[PDB]
Write a protein that binds this DNA or RNA. Structure first.
Ligand SMILES: *[C@@H]1O[C@H](CO)[C@@H](O)[C@H](O)[C@H]1NC(C)=O
Lengths: 109, 122, 196
DNA sequence: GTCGGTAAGGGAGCTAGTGTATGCCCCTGAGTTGGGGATATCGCCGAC
DNA sequence: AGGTGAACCTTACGTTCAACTGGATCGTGTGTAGGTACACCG
């Protein structure tokens, strides 16, 4: 599987970075990562299409990036309603769709 | 908008068969590959199965290899997953993802998904 | 005077297989290549026989737009005087080409999981292909000196082979949509030039 | 008040609507989408 | 739901004088799963 921070916290307004890493096969060689945001008791829906892209209709603030073997999501000016779980996906060799794991964002309310 | 509805299934005894059906509408089913993804209660996601756009080629996660069977029919626009030899740890909520246009290696639509509980109790 | 229907070609839902490349005539319009960009990351736009910088100051009797799909390592074969499976069996371009090609990656949109069998290319042929010729016959191609009376088997293969496009393919092995605009001009009124 | 140094006289970057140099895809090619080098006029604060 | 059996160019490369000599190794370097499944105790 992939490795992600257990939890990330940050006050509203600033920039928050969430990073996930894996071996060369998962993301290091294949640039097919894509991140999903799942709210409590809701169906996860795509947030970051491809290594760095976004499907139509999603917020502009979210931005995906790749640094060598790691893949990161940057959120600018996040609000309280962005509190949810975030997973980083990746297509590895011979299929085997690995998943990020778990990462929760909280707002200092 | 595009809908995806899972038939679902109630609590079943361990090691018993169970058929789950995902019905999709609002987009062309027969040109994209569906995925079945499980999520244990309170845990992260985990890919379970995927089927090609015509059912020729199917892939399963190593955890469910040799026990599950994912198929689909385009005549009535439906996807099926058959579960055999269930285990207590398999309890989870199942989502029937689509992989719509501009991406097929990735999961997009993520229909509501049903819940399956595997406990030896009434 | 109306904009050329380049959307109907570039934005087309599905591209035909290389062995059955389409051909759409474009005329009575203005070629505004400015809008053509910002449509996927183009992989090749190279023109022979006409300087692109002045493309907006001349037009022709007509232009033929042929669209198809080929793998990246194969796209280099779409050019005059080139050699290769496509160059001799599927799509052959005259040495005096008056026109040019455009190619852009379509992996995200045209690479099904487990293999996309909707696209086929002719892997066997008795003789090379003449310039701008289409072949669609699926007769069994005998290789040895043993006639097979049109039955697939030993030493008698099906001429067409389906492209095995997959997401996990190589960087150059992913599908690439190619649109070739052949500018044909004669002693006839010009049809397709953009703003002066 | 006069003159010499100035991310500056030659380095790097790419993304089409369009300016003067952190720009111009200028000029087109390994086809995987991009290579090095073209006239500097320069302009302006600060130390002497 | 597995073991023999015979295949079918099998599908996915890492390339140009060619083809199968008609072997799974074979010229240059291949490689394999399902099943077609019809009894069992179930
Ligand atoms: C083709 O489709 C894309 C995305 O749907 C769109 O942005 C683009 O404008 C279309 N092509 C042209 C030439 O307009």
């Amino acid at each position: 599987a992939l490795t992600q921070p257990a939890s990330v916290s940050g006050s509203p307004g600033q920039s928050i970075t969430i990073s996930c890493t894996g071996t060369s096969s998962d993301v290091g060689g294949y640039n097919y990562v894509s991140w999903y945001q799942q709210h409590p008791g809701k169906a996860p829906k795509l947030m970051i299409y491809d290594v760095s892209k976004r499907p139509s209709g999603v917020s502009n603030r979210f931005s995906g990036s790749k640094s060598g073997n790691t893949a990161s999501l940057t959120i600018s000016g996040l609000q309280s309603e962005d509190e949810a779980d975030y997973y980083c996906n990746s297509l590895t060799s011979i299929s085997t769709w690995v998943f990020g794991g778990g990462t929760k964002l909280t707002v200092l309310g | 908008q595009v809908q995806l509805v899972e038939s679902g299934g109630g609590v079943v005894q361990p090691g018993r068969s169970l058929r789950l059906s995902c019905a999709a509408s609002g987009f062309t089913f027969s040109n994209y590959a569906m995925y079945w993804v499980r999520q244990a209660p309170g845990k992260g996601l985990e890919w379970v199965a995927v089927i090609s756009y015509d059912g020729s080629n199917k892939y399963y996660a190593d955890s469910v290899k040799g026990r599950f069977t994912i198929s689909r029919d385009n005549s009535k626009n439906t996807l099926y997953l058959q579960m055999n030899s269930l285990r207590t740890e398999d309890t989870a909520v199942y989502y029937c993802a689509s992989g719509s246009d501009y991406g097929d290696y990735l999961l997009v639509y993520w229909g509501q998904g049903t819940l399956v509980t595997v406990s030896s109790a009434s | 005077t109306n904009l050329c229907p380049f959307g109907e070609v570039f934005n087309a839902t599905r591209f035909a297989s290389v062995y059955a490349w389409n051909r759409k005539r474009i005329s009575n319009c203005v070629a505004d290549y400015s809008v053509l960009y910002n449509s996927a990351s183009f992989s090749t736009f190279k023109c022979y026989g006409v300087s692109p910088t002045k493309l907006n100051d001349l037009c022709f009797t007509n232009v033929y737009a042929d669209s198809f799909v080929i793998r990246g390592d194969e796209v280099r074969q779409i050019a005059p005087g080139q050699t290769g499976k496509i160059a001799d069996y599927n799509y052959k371009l005259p040495d005096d080409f008056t026109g040019c090609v455009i190619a852009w990656n379509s992996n995200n949109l045209d690479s099904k999981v487990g293999g996309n069998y909707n696209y086929l290319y002719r892997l066997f042929r008795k003789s090379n292909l003449k310039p701008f010729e289409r072949d669609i016959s699926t007769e069994i191609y005998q290789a040895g000196s043993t006639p097979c009376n049109g039955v697939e088997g030993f030493n008698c293969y099906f001429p067409l082979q389906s492209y095995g496009f997959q997401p996990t393919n190589g960087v150059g092995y992913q599908p690439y949509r190619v649109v070739v605009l052949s500018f044909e001009l004669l002693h006839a009124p010009a049809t397709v030039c953009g703003p002066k």
